[PDB]
Design a protein around this ligand. Structure first.
Ligand SMILES: NC(=O)c1ccc[n+]([C@@H]2O[C@H](COP(=O)([O-])OP(=O)(O)OC[C@H]3O[C@@H](n4cnc5c(N)ncnc54)[C@H](OP(=O)(O)O)[C@@H]3O)[C@@H](O)[C@H]2O)c1
Lengths: 48, 145, 212
């Protein structure tokens, strides 16, 4: 039905050049903590 | 020389357990990440108008995004991929408690309830996983006969 | 078993008394809900006042096993079970607990069949060096929380009957009374193996009339 589409995805590291070092480092710490909590959640969920 | 001569000579082997990872993107130190984009980019973008993907998943013929990627990129499963597929397909189930007297924490065969070591998942299930995944003859039991 | 005991009224024993009145007397259906509700209070009292502290406490911060790294678990085991003053493991079965944990770490973090970096638990008689050696081989284990499977294994190891009862409370669940009360009498003779060598955490049996 003539449904054409295109999406372009750009490497996420190009986002980080848009922000300051402090913003980036705050984000890195938050994501690191979230990732650890996600692994916790994931393995609990998988086995139960 | 008896058993004491060879007991201290003999040595303990570590068998790997599947440690499935979420594969969050790797974050570089700021200095490295600063070199990829142009210097002018800092403060130039309205970040409310930059759209990012923060998460993704799938359910498909090769399981989840993690297992489908292993099969797509590498053509075979790691230990993590095999255990994930065996769990997805109901081959293995987790067990924490008494199992035939002795206390057991780990995978068992879903049918028999026999303990399964992670290192044995491949030999025990991989052939079944590969036969009952991906593009294959239509299985009537999956489509109401 | 519900039997009266005459103990010196230390902080430890006064905590025991409070929990007898407010937790251990509750029926089974209301126990786990009460533990969940009073969780932070119970943890703070264990850590302040009792001879079995809350295991999952890292630099004075209450955690859970689920929110500790493998390295934090290994180091907490050494902090509670290895006596610096005598440079030894208080009980060999506690050394075996810790060695069995370090092998689990290697198993979880190794990509292939390899040799254990702890061939004999005798290597744990220098526990910091053994920990450093395992976590240098598997540095991902410094950053990752326990796999949920390794939490269950750790708690299964805490209930090993052929072992001196662990000197901590590792979980708040239906077995809390057993974790709290079991093997409560040796600490008054071995204050070197109690958190702050603090007598006030311990159970000393003594009679009120004889005490004169
Ligand atoms: N009449 C009195 O006034 C009086 C006063 C003090 C004590 N007692 C009695 O003395 C007995 C022990 O007292 P308790 O308060 O210590 O009772 P408890 O807390 O139940 O006993 C300690 C238990 O820990 C285990 N244990 C300790 N060290 C161990 C090791 N190295 N290896 C393996 N297991 C170990 C044993 O249990 P498992 O065998 O189950 O592993 C032992 O039964 C009790 O029967 C108690 O009633 C009586």
């Amino acid at each position: 039905g003539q449904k054409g589409g295109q999406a372009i995805v750009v490497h996420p590291d190009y986002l980080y050049g848009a922000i300051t070092e402090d913003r980036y480092n705050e984000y890195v710490a938050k994501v690191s903590a979230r990732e650890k909590s996600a692994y916790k959640f994931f393995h609990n969920g998988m086995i139960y | 020389n008896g058993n004491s001569a060879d007991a201290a000579y003999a040595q303990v082997e570590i068998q790997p357990r599947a440690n499935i990872q979420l594969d969050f993107p790797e974050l570089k130190p700021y200095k490295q990440v600063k070199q990829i984009a142009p210097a002018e980019l800092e403060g130039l973008l309205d970040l409310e108008r930059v759209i990012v993907v923060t998460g993704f998943a799938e359910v498909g013929p090769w399981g989840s995004a993690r297992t489908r990627w292993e099969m797509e990129a590498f053509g075979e499963f790691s230990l993590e991929g095999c255990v994930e597929m065996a769990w997805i397909m109901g081959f293995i189930s987790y067990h924490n408690g008494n199992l035939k007297g002795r206390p057991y924490t780990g995978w068992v065969d879903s049918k028999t309830k026999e303990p399964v070591d992670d290192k044995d998942v491949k030999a025990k299930y991989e052939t079944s996983i590969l036969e009952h995944s991906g593009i294959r003859l239509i299985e009537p039991e999956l489509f109401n006969g | 078993m519900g039997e009266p005991i005459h103990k010196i009224a230390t902080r430890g024993v006064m905590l025991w008394k409070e929990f007898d009145e407010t937790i251990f007397n509750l029926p089974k259906n209301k126990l786990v809900p009460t533990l969940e509700a009073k969780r932070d209070y119970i943890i703070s009292r264990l850590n302040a006042d009792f001879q079995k502290p809350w295991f999952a406490t890292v630099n004075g911060q209450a955690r859970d096993l689920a929110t500790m790294t493998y390295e934090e678990v290994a180091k907490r085991l050494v902090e509670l079970m290895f006596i610096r003053s005598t440079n030894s493991w208080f009980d060999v079965t506690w050394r075996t607990f810790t060695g069995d944990f370090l092998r689990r770490v290697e198993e979880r973090f190794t990509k292939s069949k390899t040799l254990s970096l702890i061939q004999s638990y005798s290597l744990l008689d220098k526990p910091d060096e053994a920990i450093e050696k395992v976590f240098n081989a598997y540095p991902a284990a410094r950053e990752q929380f326990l796999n949920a499977q390794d939490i269950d294994h750790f708690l299964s190891m805490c209930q090993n009957p052929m072992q001196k009862p662990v000197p901590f409370v590792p979980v708040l669940d239906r077995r809390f009374e057993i974790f709290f009360k079991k093997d409560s009498l040796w600490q008054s003779e071995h204050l070197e193996a109690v958190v702050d060598q603090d007598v006030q955490r311990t159970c000393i049996l003594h009679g009120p009339v004889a005490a004169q």
